[PDB]
Amino acid sequence: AKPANKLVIVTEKILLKKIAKIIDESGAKGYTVMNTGGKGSDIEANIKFEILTETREMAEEIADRVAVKYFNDYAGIIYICSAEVLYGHTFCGPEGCSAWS
Amino acid sequence: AKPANKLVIVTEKILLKKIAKIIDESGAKGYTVMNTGGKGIEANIKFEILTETREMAEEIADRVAVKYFNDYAGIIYICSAEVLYGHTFCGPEGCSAWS
Amino acid sequence: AKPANKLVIVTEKILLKKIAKIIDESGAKGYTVMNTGGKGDIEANIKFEILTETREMAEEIADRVAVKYFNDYAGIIYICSAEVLYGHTFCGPEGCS
Numbered sequence: 004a005k006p007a008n009k010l011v012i013v014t015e016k017i018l019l020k021k022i023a024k025i026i027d028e029s030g031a032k033g034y035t036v037m038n039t040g041g042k043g044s045d046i047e048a049n050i051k052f053e054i055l056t057e058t059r060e061m062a063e064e065i066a067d068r069v070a071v072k073y074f075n076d077y078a079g080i081i082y083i084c085s086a087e088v089l090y091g092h093t094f095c096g097p098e099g100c101s102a103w104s
Numbered sequence: 105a106k107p108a109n110k111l112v113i114v115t116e117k118i119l120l121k122k123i124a125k126i127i128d129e130s131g132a133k134g135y136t137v138m139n140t141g142g143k144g145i146e147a148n149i150k151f152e153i154l155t156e157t158r159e160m161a162e163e164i165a166d167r168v169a170v171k172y173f174n175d176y177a178g179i180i181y182i183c184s185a186e187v188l189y190g191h192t193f194c195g196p197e198g199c200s201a202w203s
Numbered sequence: 204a205k206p207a208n209k210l211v212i213v214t215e216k217i218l219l220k221k222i223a224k225i226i227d228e229s230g231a232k233g234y235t236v237m238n239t240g241g242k243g244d245i246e247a248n249i250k251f252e253i254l255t256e257t258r259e260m261a262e263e264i265a266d267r268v269a270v271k272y273f274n275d276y277a278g279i280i281y282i283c284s285a286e287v288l289y290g291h292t293f294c295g296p297e298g299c300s
Contacts, residue, residue: 007281011185013136023245033279035213035250036240042124043134043192051136055281063188070189080134080190082108082154084183084283089262090269091279114235141236143227145219150235162288169289179233179290181207181254183283 004087005100010062012052012069013041014079019050022069029065031056032093043078055086055094105186106199109161113151113168114140115178120149123168127153130164133192154185154193204286205299210253210261212268213239214278219249222268229264231255232292241277254285254293 012022019036026034034054041049056062066081073079088100113123120137127135135153142148155161165180172178187199194200212222219236226234234253241248255261265280272278287293294300 004282009281009283023242027242033242035248036245037138037237037250040137041134042128042137046124046137049136051138055279066188074189074191078191080154080187080193082110082185082187082190083105084110084185086281086283089265089280089282090273091281092273092277094279138237143223143233145223145236148235150237165288173289173291177291179254179293180288181209181285181290182204182288183209183285 004089005057005095007055007057007086007088007094008059008062009084009086010054010056010065010081011084012054012066012079012081013039013049014073015077016048016050018073018077021073022052025068026052026054026065029068030061031065055088057094059083105188105201105203106156106194108154108156108185108187108193109158110183110185111153111155111161111164112181112183113153113178114142115149115172116176117147117149119172119176122172123151126167126171127151127164130160132160132164154187156193158182204288205256205294207254207256207285207287207293208258208261209283209285210255210264210280211283212251212253212265212278212280213241213248214272215276216247216249218272218276221272222251225267225271226251226253226264229267230260231264254287256293
């Protein structure tokens with residue numbers, strides 16, 4: 004297994020393409036996005052991005068860049084979880100996630 | 105970053121408003137909720153709630169489970185998280201960036 | 204609370220029923236699945252989340268999904284720690300004590 008940070012961004016849907024561009028420019032290999040309901044009826048339609056990164060640095064760079072650009076003006080939360088990647092051709096490369104020295 | 109507990113509730117979709125009322129009364133600052141599927145594949149719902157303490161998370165879990173989960177299907181679990189940004193979660197002071 | 208392993212699988216939507224079969228055959232008690240998007244334009248994919256009482260059960264699901272599909276279909280599998288607080292099926296009738 005390969006260590007990873009899982010970065011989660013929950014914010015306004017209008018920001019979808021701008022945030023995707025930031026993730027793309029970061030070096031992260033990819034992302035998952037989903038429609039959510041958010042209360043922060045007063046439920047509103049949000050989006051949630053999930054990004055695995057190999058380093059905590061990469062995750063903080065994405066978080067910092069999203070927040071600095073948008074979070075004065077738009078509601079949002081960004082948080083980080085630990086994770087281990089078991090399989091993932093792009094994340095782990097072709098040697099896979101359980102290579103030996 | 106600020107430590108958080110992430111409380112997840114997966115349950116029947118008919119309980120959405122009922123469970124949202126409990127979360128709103130708890131003092132948690134917000135929640136996300138999403139439409140999901142479970143083994144029937146039948147439509148259900150998933151809430152995710154960040155709390156500043158484990159006690160707050162447990163109080164929400166206890167109240168939801170006792171009120172509904174002896175009558176409706178539901179599962180409640182908790183994970184650790186660290187919050188980097190969040191005006192409402194961390195407050196106007198921010199998420200303690202040098203901690 | 205009961206310690207648990209949270210296994211997540213993100214893969215192509217066409218695989219939904221075939222992955223669900225592997226989860227069901229594993230001994231896992233159930234799963235949540237959702238429609239998601241991935242970098243494409245974004246394109247549609249699916250995400251499963253499965254809680255298991257042991258690590259080896261999670262890995263057995265991961266290994267079986269990757270060996271059958273991941274030479275031919277895109278996919279990522281990862282694992283997180285969790286604790287279950289309430290869950291009649293996961294914890295048994297005594298609860299998650």
